[PDB]
Ligand binder design. Structure first.
Ligand SMILES: CC(C)(C#Cc1ccc(-c2ccc(Cl)c3c(NS(C)(=O)=O)nn(CC(F)(F)F)c23)c([C@H](Cc2cc(F)cc(F)c2)NC(=O)Cn2nc(C(F)(F)F)c3c2C(F)(F)[C@@H]2C[C@H]32)n1)S(C)(=O)=O
Ligand SMILES: CC(C)(C#Cc1ccc(-c2ccc(Cl)c3c(NS(C)(=O)=O)nn(CC(F)(F)F)c23)c([C@H](Cc2cc(F)cc(F)c2)NC(=O)Cn2nc(C(F)(F)F)c3c2C(F)(F)[C@@H]2C[C@H]32)n1)S(C)(=O)=O
Ligand SMILES: CC(C)(C#Cc1ccc(-c2ccc(Cl)c3c(NS(C)(=O)=O)nn(CC(F)(F)F)c23)c([C@H](Cc2cc(F)cc(F)c2)NC(=O)Cn2nc(C(F)(F)F)c3c2C(F)(F)[C@@H]2C[C@H]32)n1)S(C)(=O)=O
Ligand SMILES: CC(C)(C#Cc1ccc(-c2ccc(Cl)c3c(NS(C)(=O)=O)nn(CC(F)(F)F)c23)c([C@H](Cc2cc(F)cc(F)c2)NC(=O)Cn2nc(C(F)(F)F)c3c2C(F)(F)[C@@H]2C[C@H]32)n1)S(C)(=O)=O
Ligand SMILES: CC(C)(C#Cc1ccc(-c2ccc(Cl)c3c(NS(C)(=O)=O)nn(CC(F)(F)F)c23)c([C@H](Cc2cc(F)cc(F)c2)NC(=O)Cn2nc(C(F)(F)F)c3c2C(F)(F)[C@@H]2C[C@H]32)n1)S(C)(=O)=O
Ligand SMILES: CC(C)(C#Cc1ccc(-c2ccc(Cl)c3c(NS(C)(=O)=O)nn(CC(F)(F)F)c23)c([C@H](Cc2cc(F)cc(F)c2)NC(=O)Cn2nc(C(F)(F)F)c3c2C(F)(F)[C@@H]2C[C@H]32)n1)S(C)(=O)=O
Ligand SMILES: [Cl-]
Ligand SMILES: [Cl-]
Ligand SMILES: [Cl-]
Ligand SMILES: [Cl-]
Ligand SMILES: [Cl-]
Ligand SMILES: [Cl-]
Ligand SMILES: [Cl-]
Ligand SMILES: [Cl-]
Ligand SMILES: [Cl-]
Ligand SMILES: [Cl-]
Ligand SMILES: [Cl-]
Ligand SMILES: [Cl-]
Ligand SMILES: [Cl-]
Ligand SMILES: [Cl-]
Ligand SMILES: [Cl-]
Ligand SMILES: [Cl-]
Ligand SMILES: [Cl-]
Ligand SMILES: [Cl-]
Ligand SMILES: [Cl-]
Ligand SMILES: [Cl-]
Ligand SMILES: [Cl-]
Ligand SMILES: [Cl-]
Ligand SMILES: [Cl-]
Ligand SMILES: [Cl-]
Lengths: 220, 220, 220, 220, 220, 220
């Protein structure tokens, strides 16, 4: 990663063993459950493209997911290059060349070029751009490896309301879109797919009930 | 988090893998027992709103609770906005715009704006305001997920007084309120719900007995 | 905690995850065995009142003990305030208000006021005063949760002398008082409650025998 | 390793017990699965040749592979020497002699000469040259210890498409080459070795299908 | 402990949770095997007397031994006092009073007086004097809790010579003395207590045989 | 150990708990397998003689090996003293006395004298000299505790060639000598003790076959 020293300079630091192991173990145990994204984002804090490639290369298995990840990265790399055509010319003494999509992904850039970009003034944050592409890719995988659709979450006749809302939002969290799309899913389904007893109770509460009020009203 | 380095400057640091892991593990093992609040408060020491969102996002399961958490956050954010009317105008070169509620919650603010607010002179401590909203929300979840009422905690005819006082205060701590009447639940409900043998001993102790005095008197 | 930076300034540091976990685990495994006090004292090195409250709030269970702890703290807080009546008046530019008992315990003080007190010149060590009150409270709990009295420690007819002295001083360590009180317990009981064979041997050694000499004399 | 301290100077540091342990454990559990290469590359960040030799020497077992590793290192060292002819002559007071192949490999160079090369201006990065030779050697070991060929990876008549793509790319990654024909193995061999049900679906998708599109189309 | 920071100043640091835990665990698993002494000496590197008392106080059980430890400490403290007669007189502004025995042991000295002594110019190293007394006491405990005498360590008729030498020196190390006669126990008692087959071989080796030569000669 | 601070000064640091435990555990689990030497060398990076004595004193068991270690050290100490006769005379204000063999081994030197030697300009590295003696001793123990001779490694009639080369070089690694001696062992035995099928294949390859080529030729 790139961290600040006490001189105020952004300097490269080695990825710690603890960071590597934490990422390997969290994929081992949680696969592509939705909480893998924040874990990956937090563990890759300050990462260079090299660090991000290190983390993704240490994943054992799920190689189909990892290949989808590369295809996502390549599309985002192609989009970056078409929005940032590089301008030919000698790079000046105090400068860095402009990065191409393959440079952000680390396939055509050295770690020293990545450090130069990330510690420049102003910085060109190839690590955070790459991370964006990867997390975009991981979001697709979480959505693809989600077993259940939001339309299939229906409260059982003896199922406690808390357990049902747990399943509802767990399912909703794995199909990532805008929250505009997730507010629409809730307003469309959460009360309508409650069991007949709780549904009649919540209809009387009206559309303005908070979730806390809905869960208290269907308590047992 | 934003911590002071070894020289006295407030710097951004990455959330550590141990901090991430410790918070995930505490929710896994303790759910919303009351001791999750101090663990969350201590593990989020110096957190930015991004750090707090990371921690909350790493929680697997309990998504009904996490949704209640967002609704509490949004209520407090709207209250913040109603108390901090917007002042339109170009932000001056040195300084930073006033934060809205969604900026404190981290949904419309970047990490660099959060660093800018938290390291300002004087600092606008968005991380601690956000943290205060979250703990307010987590306190509701603890209250709601507490199974038993204090009026149902009663000493068995053969149950040692110590175990009953353990159950009593464990319950009182989960059923959260101000000390206005929790102070009230002790000293009279604690005696009223003692078994007849210990209850008879505790009347003889008279008003003003310490809990140590009550526990010594009902040992045998 | 409050630690020294390399500038010579006492600065606040976040309580580490390792410190929190160590305290939670040691209470989980050792309850209120006497070695909980030094573990708590060492783990709370440099603690602010906030850190001490964090540690005690993370304890799961033993809530009867924790309430006795609060009653001890409140008595010590009441004693502090009666010995340190606060003097009204505007606090000067370079100063801190004088702390009340509730400020030392952290119920009416902010972490910033605790930092101001603890890093003042000279420091007013509210953290070490609070710790004193807490450890005073923990000593009462260790003494209350001790199963055996010193008068019941009697050497068995086939019990090795080392095992008996182990039990004797383990029991003596849980009833904390002055060592004047613990030297008196030893001189009164250790030889007199040895089994008849070892007792006759140790009577001949005389009152001036070291424990090492007594244990060699009753070896087997 | 040679890392930058908190002030900006390149200093030698001892390899940490966690780094040593992490590398030993990764070889123990993963042998020469492909993910051992990124683990070795990341754990050897900033390594001197002495550090790299230490890491390789801590490997227990797999001594046939480790001997192949030495033979690869020696071939690269001889290639280095043929490209860097020796210049005889007294080394000047300030500077350091040119490294031979055996010096990069650490067999004829001391740790202080390795520090001298790596902290020179400009640096001669013997640790990264050595690391590049080792990973070249470890890549051969992975290729050799890969049990299955990509031509033998075929989808079963009832095997889900996802599991087959997992096996396909896991295998392709172990059978190491350039993307010249690994790019080639995908998109046609991946389809050719699908079972007849999915194969029929994938012809209808036509050329240019993403892996996400192929995996969505053969879900059911 | 009192350690040097990154700038060259001697500063007080809190004993780490790992150091506390490591010492507790070592006593739990190894009791008073000889290797507890180096573990205690290394884990108490730079300790103040308060740190040493903390470590000793965290020991659960073995209270008979811990009481022997106090008696040894008190004997050494009295010897220290008899060699360092008190000089009455007001302590000058810059300097510190001379330490008594109880101050080195930490029973009549505060942590700040211990820091003052240890960081003085020249330093009065009360922590190392205290440590020396404790290890003297722990050495007595190891000697006393060693079950077997060196005269009872003898090679079985079918026991491999290596295992017997292992038992021999393991025992010799627990039965602690100076090398005046431990040097003596080897080379003649080691041969005398060998079984007749190996004993006959070792006479033929003659005086001056190394232990490697003896162990090679009694392999078969 | 002796580490560099940020002032450029070599300063003493306490041996970490993690370093102590790592060395104890690696001996516990791996005994004197050959990888114990690099683990010991890496874990004792920067060690003082005191640290090296600490590490070796913490080893439980294998006391016969540890005594052979002392005899090796004493021979190397005797050789050092006969090559470095100390010259009598007052030590100057800015100087350190010359170290004897017993000073390098730490039996007649204080930790402060070891720090003085190791941080002198130029340094006299008693820690690295001692380490050399110890590792010389550990090499003898690895060679003594090796069960199998190189002449007994013969490929089985159904044994895969990789497994046989594994055993061959594992055995060869435990009998440490020069690689001149280990190249001679390979050229003498590796092909000649292959099973009759693989032997005839490798004879045709000729003496110039790499190990990688030999292992591919005897694949199955
Ligand atoms: C960097 C990174 C780690 C990030 C970020 C990141 C950034 C912002 C926000 C956020 C913060 C505050 C509010 Cl008030 C809202 C909001 N209020 S609103 C308009 O009503 O929805 N929305 N947001 C998302 C925003 F801003 F993106 F829109 C937020 C989050 C929340 C943090 C959070 C998690 C939590 F558990 C509980 C909380 F109280 C807050 N995380 C999510 O909300 C994820 N989530 N998804 C869904 C579902 F799909 F089911 F609906 C559900 C959640 C849920 F909250 F967990 C809960 C069960 C419901 N995280 S990264 C690149 O890896 O992602
Ligand atoms: C979360 C966070 C931000 C915080 C804080 C925070 C802030 C202040 C205080 C506090 C400190 C000292 C006193 Cl004397 C009192 C007091 N004395 S009084 C006039 O009698 O009420 N009150 N308080 C709360 C105050 F100030 F809020 F009012 C306190 C606490 C205590 C700390 C504490 C915990 C403990 F175990 C034992 C202690 F001795 C002290 N924690 C609680 O008290 C929680 N608790 N709740 C109840 C119940 F509900 F059952 F009654 C019960 C407890 C209990 F003590 F554990 C015990 C069984 C009874 N914590 S953080 C930094 O931890 O992350
Ligand atoms: C900060 C903190 C961690 C502290 C402190 C703290 C401060 C000082 C001292 C101390 C130091 C040296 C001596 Cl010589 C005496 C002494 N010599 S004397 C006049 O003969 O008794 N007395 N003391 C206590 C003093 F000073 F307080 F009086 C001491 C201790 C000892 C440290 C110690 C522990 C140990 F195991 C073995 C040792 F050699 C020394 N710890 C105790 O002694 C606790 N203990 N209690 C009893 C019993 F009840 F059974 F008798 C028993 C012990 C015992 F020693 F373990 C042993 C079985 C007997 N600790 S804190 C706030 O959390 O407490
Ligand atoms: C060892 C080290 C020094 C390094 C490096 C290193 C350097 C660059 C790159 C890389 C980055 C981005 C893209 Cl877009 C491509 C690309 N896009 S492309 C035009 O389609 O080929 N190619 N590359 C390799 C490049 F640049 F070398 F060509 C890359 C990688 C990727 C990192 C990565 C891993 C991952 F899991 C998922 C990702 F999204 C990205 N790792 C690999 O690709 C390894 N891999 N191999 C194969 C196979 F053989 F099966 F095909 C397969 C993978 C796979 F991706 F895992 C997946 C199943 C398929 N690593 S380090 C720092 O880790 O220690
Ligand atoms: C506690 C502490 C403060 C200290 C120190 C401390 C100080 C010095 C020395 C030492 C160093 C080198 C030599 Cl050559 C000799 C020597 N050579 S000699 C002329 O033959 O006697 N003697 N010494 C002790 C000296 F100096 F004190 F005399 C030493 C030791 C050795 C270190 C060591 C341990 C080891 F395993 C193997 C080694 F090669 C060296 N440790 C011991 O020797 C302990 N030991 N005891 C006996 C027994 F009793 F059975 F005989 C046995 C050992 C044994 F070696 F393990 C082995 C089975 C035999 N430690 S600390 C820093 O660790 O925390
Ligand atoms: C500081 C310390 C930690 C050190 C060092 C240290 C110093 C240098 C070297 C070394 C480096 C590069 C080359 Cl190219 C050769 C070489 N090339 S050559 C002329 O053809 O043999 N030789 N060397 C040893 C040299 F220089 F000493 F001669 C080397 C090693 C290698 C490092 C290494 C280990 C490894 F696993 C795989 C590698 F590719 C490289 N370690 C060994 O080789 C140990 N080993 N022993 C034998 C056997 F006996 F079976 F043959 C076998 C090995 C083996 F390699 F593992 C493998 C199965 C064969 N380590 S310390 C004081 O604790 O030792
Ligand atoms: Cl780490
Ligand atoms: Cl890269
Ligand atoms: Cl894989
Ligand atoms: Cl989820
Ligand atoms: Cl509910
Ligand atoms: Cl960490
Ligand atoms: Cl955010
Ligand atoms: Cl009780
Ligand atoms: Cl930590
Ligand atoms: Cl507080
Ligand atoms: Cl509780
Ligand atoms: Cl005890
Ligand atoms: Cl005994
Ligand atoms: Cl470490
Ligand atoms: Cl080397
Ligand atoms: Cl799929
Ligand atoms: Cl720690
Ligand atoms: Cl003390
Ligand atoms: Cl042997
Ligand atoms: Cl450590
Ligand atoms: Cl020493
Ligand atoms: Cl031993
Ligand atoms: Cl081996
Ligand atoms: Cl093979």
């Amino acid at each position: 990663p790139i961290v600040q020293n006490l001189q105020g300079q952004m300097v490269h630091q080695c990825i710690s063993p603890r960071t590597l192991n934490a990422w390997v173990k969290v994929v081992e145990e949680k696969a592509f459950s939705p909480e893998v994204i924040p874990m990956f984002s937090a563990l890759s804090c300050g990462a260079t493209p090299q660090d991000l490639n290190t983390m993704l290369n240490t994943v054992g298995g799920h190689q189909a997911a990892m290949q989808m990840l590369k295809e996502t990265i390549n599309e985002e790399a192609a989009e970056w290059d078409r929005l940032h055509p590089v301008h030919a010319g000698p790079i000046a003494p105090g400068q860095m060349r402009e990065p191409r999509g393959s440079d952000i992904a680390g396939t055509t850039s050295t770690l020293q070029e990545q450090i130069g970009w990330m510690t420049h003034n102003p910085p060109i944050p190839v690590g955070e751009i790459y991370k964006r592409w990867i997390i975009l890719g991981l979001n697709k995988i979480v959505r693809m490896y989600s077993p259940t659709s939001i339309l299939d979450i229906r409260q059982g006749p003896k199922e406690p309301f808390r357990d049902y809302v747990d399943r509802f939002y767990k399912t909703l969290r794995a199909e990532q879109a805008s929250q505009e799309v997730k507010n629409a899913a809730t307003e469309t389904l959460l009360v309508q797919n409650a069991n007949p007893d709780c549904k009649t109770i919540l209809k009387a509460l009206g559309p303005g009930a908070t979730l806390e009020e809905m869960m208290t009203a269907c308590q047992g």
